[PDB]
């Protein structure tokens, strides 16, 4: 007897019992971060430990289940994700050493504090103070002490720890039949078994360079933009021929950048859009804005939401003895039981986030009709893009006025667009250098062309050509300023922001043109598109069965992401990148050093 029936009944049985477990697990995460009680913590320690038991067992059991005698191809990806040989091929000694290393760093990470110079009593948990001073003001030595210390305590204690972790990860996923730990990470984007649209583990090396060298003429001048957008800052401590110090990252790896811009500003007299006094005068509430969003989505044809959604969803801050943090998120409990959480307070960003979660309600009701082990979108790239399409369209004055924040007597101008583009210029343009740095450094080391001891040094000719940061205190293996942040303190990768950036304008243009709209891709809105609404709702019904080119050719007709929109959709920005720099130095030389 063939094993196709065996494995499909096996995956269905996993669906049943592991869906009991994962249903109570989604409800348990929900409870855990809404109730903090010791028995519930003991449930997290013990009952939550029952979660990890069964998946490994059938991961080992389905490992014995074979791949040869299967028609109905579906099971092939199932076992590759349910045999999950991966790390289990190697020795429990290796995996146990790395895991107990992770437990050690987790404990010491949970226990961490660093604080003020000369006054170790008004101490500073990295939450409320001098770090916020670094961003709201321009306090140089302040961000020094913060970031120096927040590695000097954490990073030094785990430097041999983290280094052994990384090198032995290299060893394991060299032995993984993959190339290294990061190709083990790379195992996400592989697709095959449909003719013509294969993706390999070596072709992706070159093409993204080409799209990045389709970034590079923009990028090297985008490079020449932040380089130039930092000119008016400091004449005496930064020579125009010099490398800029390390403590201008914005973060502990430069994850956000908008710091020196409002000092560099050419035109900053006009205040931003602030309507908080009007909210105080009128006193709207999230309940009113909730049906506001509901009827806006009705204007594009979207229905209401059921009872079990919100009879557990608490929409207000609890306070009292029930301590709950105010980070809003979108949740799902499964089996026709879906639930959401937010904190309520009058804010335009809170309204936009509520729209984010309702657009997500429809947009991930998209894949609620698939079998349990496959409930996703065509690939994982459309996700962070189709998530924020409508919210970013609402960032334009049109929908923000349709929600009634502004009076009708306001006339339309193109100066609004020019300074909105300018504002995005001094706000958002910071992350892509580091993003693609980690992406391309990842692909080379994952194939093996950049070492670990000269990580900083090779990342200096680079970064003097990426975003301009270099140590004034050079780092050897003792001193310490990468790991002051939790994200890359836990070793992830950086392709998703590139995917979002180039994909979102492609979706807007394709929706515009199937809806028969024309214009620039900053002005390419998807509102009032019912005839493409059953397309936009079909843009959200794909599955995970086909290679990405089939899904593209169906939803939009263009099989690939387009970077001619990168070189000619920036044609105005790439020029405003030049126009703002037409009377400024295009370049800022890179040879002087602070410590000589």
């Amino acid at each position: 007897s063939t094993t196709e029936d065996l494995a499909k009944t096996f995956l269905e049985k996993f669906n049943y019992e592991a869906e009991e477990l994962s249903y109570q697990n989604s409800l348990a995460s929900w409870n855990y971060n809404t109730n903090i009680t010791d028995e519930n913590i003991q449930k997290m320690n013990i009952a939550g430990a029952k979660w990890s038991a069964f998946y490994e067992e059938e991961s080992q059991h389905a490992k014995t289940y074979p791949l040869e005698e299967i028609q109905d191809p579906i099971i092939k990806r199932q076992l590759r994700a349910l045999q999950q040989s991966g790390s289990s091929v190697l020795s429990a000694d290796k995996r146990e050493r790395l895991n107990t290393i992770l437990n050690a760093m987790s404990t010491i990470y949970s226990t961490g504090k660093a604080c003020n110079p000369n006054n170790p009593q008004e101490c500073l948990l990295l939450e409320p103070g001098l770090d916020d001073i670094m961003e709201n003001s321009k306090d140089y030595n302040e961000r020094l002490w913060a970031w120096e210390g927040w590695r000097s305590e954490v990073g030094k204690q785990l430097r041999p720890l983290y280094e052994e972790y990384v090198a032995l990860k290299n060893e394991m996923a060299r032995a993984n039949n993959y190339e290294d730990y990061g190709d083990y990470w790379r195992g996400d984007y592989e697709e095959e078994w449909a003719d013509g649209y294969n993706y390999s583990r070596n072709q992706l090396i070159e093409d993204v360079e080409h799209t990045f060298t389709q970034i590079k003429p923009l990028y090297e001048h985008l490079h020449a933009y932040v380089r130039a957008k930092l000119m008016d800052a400091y004449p005496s401590r930064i020579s125009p021929t010099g490398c800029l110090p390390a403590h201008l990252l914005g973060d502990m790896w430069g994850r956000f950048w908008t710091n020196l811009y409002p000092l560099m500003v050419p035109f900053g007299q006009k205040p931003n859009i602030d309507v908080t006094d009007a909210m105080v005068n009128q006193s709207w509430d999230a309940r009113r804005i909730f049906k506001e969003a509901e009827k806006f989505f009705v204007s594009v044809g979207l229905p209401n939401m059921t009872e079990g959604f919100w009879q557990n969803s608490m929409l207000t801050e609890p306070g009292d003895n029930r301590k709950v943090v105010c980070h809003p998120t979108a949740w799902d409990l499964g089996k026709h039981d879906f639930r959401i959480k937010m904190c309520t307070k009058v804010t335009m960003d809170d309204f936009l986030t509520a729209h984010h979660e309702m657009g997500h309600i429809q947009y991930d009701m998209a894949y609620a009709a698939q079998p349990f082990l496959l409930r996703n979108g065509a690939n994982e790239g459309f996700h962070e893009a189709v998530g924020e399409i409508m919210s970013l369209s609402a960032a334009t004055p049109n929908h923000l006025k349709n929600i009634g924040l502004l009076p009708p007597d306001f006339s339309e101008d193109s100066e609004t667009d020019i300074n909105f583009l300018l504002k995005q210029a001094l706000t958002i343009v910071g992350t892509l250098p580091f993003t693609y740095m980690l992406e391309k450094w990842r692909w080379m080391v994952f194939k093996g062309e950049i070492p670990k001891e000269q990580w900083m040094q090779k990342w200096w000719e680079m970064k003097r050509d990426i975003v301009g940061v270099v140590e004034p205190l050079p780092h050897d293996e003792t001193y310490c300023d990468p790991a002051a942040l939790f994200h890359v303190a836990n070793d992830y990768s950086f392709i998703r922001y590139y995917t979002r950036t180039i994909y979102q304008f492609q979706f807007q243009e394709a929706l515009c043109q199937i809806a028969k709209h024309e214009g620039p891709l900053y002005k390419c809105d998807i509102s009032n598109s019912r005839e493409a609404g059953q397309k936009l709702h079909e843009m959200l019904s794909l599955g995970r069965s086909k290679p990405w080119t089939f899904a593209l050719e169906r939803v939009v007709g263009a099989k690939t992401m387009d970077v001619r929109p990168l070189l000619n959709y920036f044609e105005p920005l790439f020029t405003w990148l030049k126009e703002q720099n037409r009377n400024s130095f295009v370049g800022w030389n890179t040879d002087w050093s602070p410590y000589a």
Partner: protein
């Protein structure tokens, strides 16, 4: 559905083959799945189908119960006391009726 966990009631999900119209199936036996024999126990390519509700008040609309009653009026030949209620009226005398 009861609150404290409805592990009393049970579900059934599997059988071997197709079935004729109009019969009751109460099969709870081990299913032989692969080439290896089962001998009536879970093991090498073997499976026991039965599971319980375990209902908490949280389960969703599709998995919330919908009592379906199939009123199967099977038509055969009887006087069939059960046909339907009959009404009546009041009578008037000494008139052409």
């Amino acid at each position: 559905s009861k609150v404290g966990g409805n592990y009393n009631y049970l579900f059934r999900l599997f059988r071997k083959s197709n079935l004729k119209p109009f019969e009751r199936d109460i099969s709870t036996e081990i299913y032989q799945a692969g080439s290896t024999p089962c001998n009536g126990v879970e093991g090498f390519n073997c499976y026991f189908p039965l599971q319980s509700y375990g209902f908490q008040p949280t389960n969703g609309v599709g998995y919330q119960p919908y009592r379906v009653v199939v009123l199967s009026f099977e038509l055969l030949h009887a006087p069939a006391t059960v046909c339907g209620p009959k009404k009546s009226t009041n009578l008037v005398k000494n008139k052409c009726v």
